């Protein structure tokens, strides 16, 4: 219709049938993942520049669900999709096996142990 947002956790941001929350607590990747899991969700997965255009406006750097598992050789999303080289601009600021989201659809490569704010997402 015009209205009503698509079933989300309470007190979460709802946009284009997708649920987000930004978290102030500095956590490493694993703790961040665990948190999102706890709430039947997952770290931010980027899939569409049109559907997730609001990510253009969020400022600081945050954990998203993009990881290198040193076994598989390639980078991957939490759910097990590959990263399309089209989706994000990847920068190597530090060296690690996890990635922070910034800016406009950037991915900053970060040591998974270093604590940062995080973004969870649920569909």
């Amino acid at each position, epitope marked *: 219709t015009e209205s009503y947002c698509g079933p989300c956790p309470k007190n979460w941001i709802c946009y284009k049938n997708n649920c987000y929350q930004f978290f102030d607590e500095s956590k490493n990747w694993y703790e961040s993942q665990a948190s999102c899991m706890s709430q039947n969700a997952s770290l931010l997965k980027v899939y*569409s*520049k*049109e559907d997730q255009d609001l990510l*253009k406006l969020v400022k600081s750097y945050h954990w998203m669900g993009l990881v*290198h598992i040193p076994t598989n*050789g*390639s*980078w991957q999303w939490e759910d097990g999709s590959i990263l*399309s*080289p*089209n989706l994000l*601009t*990847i*920068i*190597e600021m530090q060296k690690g096996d996890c990635a922070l989201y910034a800016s*406009s*659809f950037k991915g900053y*490569i970060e040591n998974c142990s270093t604590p940062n704010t995080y973004i969870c997402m649920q569909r």
Partner: antibody
Amino acid sequence: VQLVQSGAEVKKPGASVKVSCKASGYTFTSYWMHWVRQAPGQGLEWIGKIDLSDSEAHFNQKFEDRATLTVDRSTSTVYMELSSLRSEDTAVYYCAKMGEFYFDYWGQGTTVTVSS
Amino acid sequence: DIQMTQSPSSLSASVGDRVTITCRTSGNIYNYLAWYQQKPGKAPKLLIYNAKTLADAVPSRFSGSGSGTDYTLTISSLQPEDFATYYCQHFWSIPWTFGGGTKVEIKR
């Protein structure tokens, strides 16, 4: 399956060159158009990218100070403009549309010669 | 900012030979590797993407392997239409960079 670039350009050292590229695929959503050049007796170099939909752009540190990328919604045209030219800038300039896995389509190239 | 080293620069081979070109990168590029074949005066044609995947309408004589920092293009039985310059490129961190090229000529 081919992008259309402006014709060959000749410029003096110091001057600027503006090369165009017409997309034809563009349907008001994300379309990353990249820019790559190849000097005779070189491999290729990546200059920058721009998204037709939102005009967002990124450059190689090597060119960021001398290069601009502009876009036109209506004509689907991307303009790569490189300034403060030197003779090393003599090369063939290609635009390419980046698809989901690799570059979907390349332009036909534009020769740019830079000489006194 | 990652350097690609192709190897060798030039190769002179016969129709029917095995050929292997290598691309060695200065940093891990996580299998985001492409192989291109460029004939004179034309834009590069893509053969192999993500290190090992064969592109559409590419003959299966073309095969890519490697991982990490070491990657390999193999042509099992070099054919007349395969004499060309070959390039590798990464599709990982900005800026994407290309190799110096391997120019493959006919022995006679």
